Amino acid sequence: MDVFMKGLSKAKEGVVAAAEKTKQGVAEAAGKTKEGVLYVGSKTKEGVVHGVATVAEKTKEQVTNVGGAVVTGVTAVAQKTVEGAGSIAAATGFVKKDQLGKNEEGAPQEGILEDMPVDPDNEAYEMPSEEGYQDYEPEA
Amino acid sequence: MDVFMKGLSKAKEGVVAAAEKTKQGVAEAAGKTKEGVLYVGSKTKEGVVHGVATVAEKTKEQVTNVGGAVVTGVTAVAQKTVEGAGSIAAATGFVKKDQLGKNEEGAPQEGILEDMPVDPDNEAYEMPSEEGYQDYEPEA
Amino acid sequence: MDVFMKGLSKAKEGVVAAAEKTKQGVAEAAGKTKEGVLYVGSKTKEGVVHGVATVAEKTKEQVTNVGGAVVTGVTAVAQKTVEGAGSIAAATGFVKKDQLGKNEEGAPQEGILEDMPVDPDNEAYEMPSEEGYQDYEPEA
Amino acid sequence: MDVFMKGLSKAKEGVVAAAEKTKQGVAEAAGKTKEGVLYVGSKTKEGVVHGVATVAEKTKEQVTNVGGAVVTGVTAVAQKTVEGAGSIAAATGFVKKDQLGKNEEGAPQEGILEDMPVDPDNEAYEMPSEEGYQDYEPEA
Amino acid sequence: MDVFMKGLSKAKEGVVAAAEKTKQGVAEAAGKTKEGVLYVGSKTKEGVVHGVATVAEKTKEQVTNVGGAVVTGVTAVAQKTVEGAGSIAAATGFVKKDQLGKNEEGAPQEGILEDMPVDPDNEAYEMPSEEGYQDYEPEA
Amino acid sequence: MDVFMKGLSKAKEGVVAAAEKTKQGVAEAAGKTKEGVLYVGSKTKEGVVHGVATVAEKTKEQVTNVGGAVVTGVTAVAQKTVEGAGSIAAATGFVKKDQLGKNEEGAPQEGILEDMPVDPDNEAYEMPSEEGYQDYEPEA
Amino acid sequence: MDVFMKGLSKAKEGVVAAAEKTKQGVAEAAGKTKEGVLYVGSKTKEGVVHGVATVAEKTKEQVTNVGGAVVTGVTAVAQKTVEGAGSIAAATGFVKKDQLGKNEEGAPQEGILEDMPVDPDNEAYEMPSEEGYQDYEPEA
Amino acid sequence: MDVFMKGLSKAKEGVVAAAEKTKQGVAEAAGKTKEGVLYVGSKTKEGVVHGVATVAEKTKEQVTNVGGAVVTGVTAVAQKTVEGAGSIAAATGFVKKDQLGKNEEGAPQEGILEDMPVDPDNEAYEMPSEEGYQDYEPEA
Amino acid sequence: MDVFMKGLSKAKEGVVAAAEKTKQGVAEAAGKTKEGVLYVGSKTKEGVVHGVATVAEKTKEQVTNVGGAVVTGVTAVAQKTVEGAGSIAAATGFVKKDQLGKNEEGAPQEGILEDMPVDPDNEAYEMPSEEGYQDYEPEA
Amino acid sequence: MDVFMKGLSKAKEGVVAAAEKTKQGVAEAAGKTKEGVLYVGSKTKEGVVHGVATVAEKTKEQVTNVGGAVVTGVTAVAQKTVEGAGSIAAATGFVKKDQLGKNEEGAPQEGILEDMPVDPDNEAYEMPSEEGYQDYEPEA
Numbered sequence A, B, C, D, E, F, G, H, I, J: 001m002d003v004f005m006k007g008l009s010k011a012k013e014g015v016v017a018a019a020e021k022t023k024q025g026v027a028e029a030a031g032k033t034k035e036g037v038l039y040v041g042s043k044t045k046e047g048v049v050h051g052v053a054t055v056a057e058k059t060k061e062q063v064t065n066v067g068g069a070v071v072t073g074v075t076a077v078a079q080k081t082v083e084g085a086g087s088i089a090a091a092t093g094f095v096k097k098d099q100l101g102k103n104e105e106g107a108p109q110e111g112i113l114e115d116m117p118v119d120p121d122n123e124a125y126e127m128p129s130e131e132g133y134q135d136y137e138p139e140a
Helices: none
Strands: A038-055 A061-066 A070-079 A081-083 A090-096 B028-030 B038-055 B059-067 B070-078 B079-083 B090-098 C028-030 C038-055 C063-067 C070-078 C082-083 C086-095 D039-057 D062-068 D068-080 D081-083 D088-097 E037-054 E061-064 E069-080 E081-082 E088-097 F039-055 F061-066 F070-078 F081-083 F087-096 G039-056 G061-067 G069-076 G081-083 G088-097 H038-055 H061-066 H070-078 H081-083 H088-097 I038-055 I059-065 I070-078 I080-084 I088-098 J040-053 J061-066 J070-078 J082-083 J089-097
Touching: A038 B070, A038 C070, A038 F039, A038 I070, A070 B038, A081 B059, A081 D081, A081 H088, A090 B059, A090 B070, B038 B070, B038 C070, B070 B090, B070 C086, C028 C070, C038 C070, C038 D068, C038 F081, C070 D039, C070 D088, D039 D068, D039 E069, D068 D088, D068 E037, D068 E088, D068 J089, D088 E069, E037 E069, E037 E081, E037 F070, E037 J082, E069 E088, E069 F039, E081 H088, E088 F070, F039 F070, F039 G069, F061 F087, F070 F087, F070 G039, F087 G069, G039 G069, G039 H070, G039 J082, G069 G088, G069 H038, G088 H070, G088 H081, I038 J070, I059 I088, I070 I088, I070 J040, I070 J089, I088 J070, J040 J070, J070 J089
Parallel strands: A038 B038, A038 I038, A061 B059, A061 I059, A070 B070, A070 I070, A081 B079, A081 I080, A090 B090, A090 I088, B028 C028, B038 C038, B059 C063, B070 C070, B079 C082, B090 C086, C038 D039, C063 D062, C070 D068, C082 D081, C086 D088, D039 E037, D062 E061, D068 E069, D081 E081, D088 E088, E037 F039, E061 F061, E069 F070, E081 F081, E088 F087, F039 G039, F061 G061, F070 G069, F081 G081, F087 G088, G039 H038, G061 H061, G069 H070, G081 H081, G088 H088, I038 J040, I059 J061, I070 J070, I080 J082, I088 J089
Antiparallel strands: none
16 A cells, blocks of 8 residues: 555664764773863963154254155064965055156157238227217216 | 671671671762863964154154155054965055056057067077086096 | 990981871762863953044145145054955045056967967968059149 | 461561562662763853943044045954955955946856876977087097 | 950850751752853944045036046945955945947858757767866966 | 153062961851952943044135045044945945946846836726725825 | 842751652753853943034134135944945035036027027016017007 | 523533643742843943044135035944945935936846747757647737 | 001992882782872973063154054964965054056166276276376486 | 695694784773873963163254165064065165166256246047948959
């Protein structure tokens, strides 16, 4: 009446007969309390920095002129390992300027012109004021 | 043979009641209380920074002119490992300028490259240096 | 060999035998109360920063002129690990103007004795005939 | 003839077990109260920042001119790990200006990652003929 | 002093010839009250920031001119981990000028627009393998 | 820290207390009252920020000109973890003008028929039903 | 006067119960009153912010000009975790200018058609210009 | 209706209502009064903000010009977790200029396959199943 | 003869403080409690930096002019391993300019003809026995 | 040769099996508690730097002029191994400038003045006639 018939062959279901039992493991003391690790009075530090700066009098910074970069005071960094092409780990004042362009120079093709005489003939010289037109009872 | 008198049965008498001959396993310890780990008086720190700056008088910053970048005071950073091409971990004042535009040339070909040679017979060719030493001192 | 008569002192013990009492144990015990971990007097810190700045007098910032970037005072950062191309972990004053670009140099920069040399593309040939008049201006 | 069937066992008035036979009768100290973990006097901190700034006199900010960016005062950040291409963890004053630029359609990187490089003896193929032992040598 | 030492409250305890040889009778002690975890005097903090700024005199902000961005005062942030391409965790003053308008490209030329279906080269639904014939792309 | 007045420690074996005697150790019971967890004197904080700013004199903000963005005063944020491409956790003054990326995804597919450039009136004659009858009277 | 607990037969008893009696012999505790958890002196806070700002004199805001965005005063936020592409957790002054396209998309037009009868509207209550037929249709 | 007759020994307490009973005065020695949890001296806060601002003199807001957005005073927010693409948790002054255009929310739809006809191939098998010709009797 | 010996004729050096302890004795046991590792009084540090700078009087910075870069004060960095082409681990003041080199002409600080101050000790070219070229020509 | 290789099954004397039993620990003590490693009084440091600078009087920095780079004070770095072509591990004051000849013209000596104040329209007609056809298939 079963929907599907089944048959045994190799009988692979648990030949090892594994079970929670130790052969002749019976004893007064078995499986003692394992001890992990003990740490007493130990100091561990990884990646730590501390900087202290004290200034009483004045620095006196009148006129300062620097082309590249300038760093004053105190700088501290804590690192272990670093990797990278063209990479920088610790750098005080970093400035890069480039402008090679095409590595070529050429004179200006333009800069040319031609004669353009307006040939002035008006002696009026603008002069908006004092109009030659004399109207009746001038508002001015 | 007879002198052996069997074994563990020499008495072959005594009493069976209240014999208490068997240990009955009165004392038996199994699966003791496992002990993990113990930590007493331990300090652990990872990635920590502390900076202190004190200024009494004045700095006196009249006129300051810097092209690139300038950093003053105190800077501190805590790191362990860093990776990245062109990457920067710690940099005080970072400025990169690469202006590119306006080109006089406009011909299809930027240049003809006159540097056809790939193995110059000059410069490197010049090898006036001698591998041998000026003075001779061979050991027989 | 009477030598010395008397000298009775058998009271003094010269052997351990078994004159020692044992302490009472826990007797029968199964599945003792497992002990996890114990922590007493322990300090743990990860990623912490503390900065203190005190200024009494004045800084005196009359005229300040900077092209790139400028950072003054105190800056502190706590980090452990960082990754990323072109990435920056700690940078005081970051300014980038324009950019060159990126090229994997797909074209063959170098070649080993090419039997049939060929330009990347285009490869436009030319022949002599007439030179362009656009050049010098020899009026007389 | 036993007058008393009970056997005058009035001495006993309690029964903990019947006939004794291989009866261990444990039921003693089983499943002790497991102890989790104990914490006494422990400090734990992750991702914490504290900054203090005190200014008495005046800064005196008359005229300030900066092209890129400028950050003054105190800046502090607490981080553990960071990842991202072109990403920035801590940056004081970030400014990027691009007058001329172009994107490679955001095409994927070649990532050749060659694992089979070729670099043998590379002996010079060319072999110009030279006078001496070879051919005829009447002059020498 | 009613017995001169070894008296008063001292009489006798335990020590029996044989009477009461049986201890109590039976003990259950099953399923002891399990103990979770105990916490006494412990401090835990995750993601916390505290900033204090005090200013007495005046700053004196007459004329200020900045192209990019400027941040003054105190800024503090508490973070543990961050991830994201082009993402920023902590940045004081962020300004990006991408702008628009590309005159470099100028008028179109190699547009090669998809024309109407003509002589289809995709006979098969799946696209052809890019690999065909090559072995001079690396050449170390 | 600056070391402790306690002195330099290199051993100082921990003090161990005698077990003395065990309090009974057997209550003779089943299903003892399980003990959850005990908390006495514990501080827990997650995501907290506190900022204090005090200004006496005046700032003196006459003329201020900034192209990008400017943030003055005090800013504090408490976070643990953050993720997102192009996302920003903490940024003081964020301004982005235009973007290099483009390539519009094209106009949405809805049809220009959605417009009504002719016969604005519609469904005016249509009114077979209104899915049930209901009263209405908008405020006026 | 508050009784902490009631003692049982504290005073010495003249006689003791006879163990011979079977009634009310012994009683083992079953199902003890389980103890949940105990909390005494504990502080818990999640997502809390507190900002205090005090200003005596005046700020003096005469003329202020900012292109992007500007935030002054005090800003504080409490968060734990955040996720989202292009999302922002804390940002003081956020402004993004896309300006997709440009003004007057249509190319210059000399108004090929002076008239423009589109999107009819009531001219009632409106008379920006004289509109109608030039015909006067004289009575006679 | 208006029942008043009482049943003799007929009435009986149900097990439904009897299921629920007060937990007090229970039987002693068995089923001790379980103890829930005890809380004494505990502070709990989740999502709380408090801001205080005091101004004596005047701000002096003569002429203010801002393109993007500007926020002055004090802003505080309390949050724990936030999620959403393009979402913002805390932002002071948010302005986006993009012709009120939409960025199209939601993930992209699958590519366009066929108009309607399908040609299953991954369904090929030793005994392909025929599709019912019923097709829900489509109008077609 | 003169040989001396003890009354007991003992041929062994005297010893004190047996210490004993660590006696395994005789008893059954299986799976002893394994012992991990023990750490008592140990200091471990990796990647740590500490800098302290104290200034009483003033620096006196009147006029400062630097072309490249200048760094004053104290700089300290902690690193283990670094790798990268063109990469820099620790650099105080980094500035690179690649726009247009000037005509920095300059003559060499050394350039003389090989006069050969010392020559082989040849008797033919060296005649210490005779001073000068004077020729002997005595009248007698 | 000799039919039936089998033979010499019976030993002349004694047994072939080893007297000693393999894999001991059959009982008594087996699997002793392995001991990891013990560390008492040990100091380990990797990558650590410490610099201290104290200045009483003044430095007296009147006029300072440096072409390349200058570093004053104290600089210390801790490293183990470094690799990279053209890479620098520790360098105080690094400045590199290009050195190209040319520069024949374009000197600042020449002044540039904008001509044609009226700025007349130029020839922007960059669309010359070019050969090309929609279809190409000569029938000849």
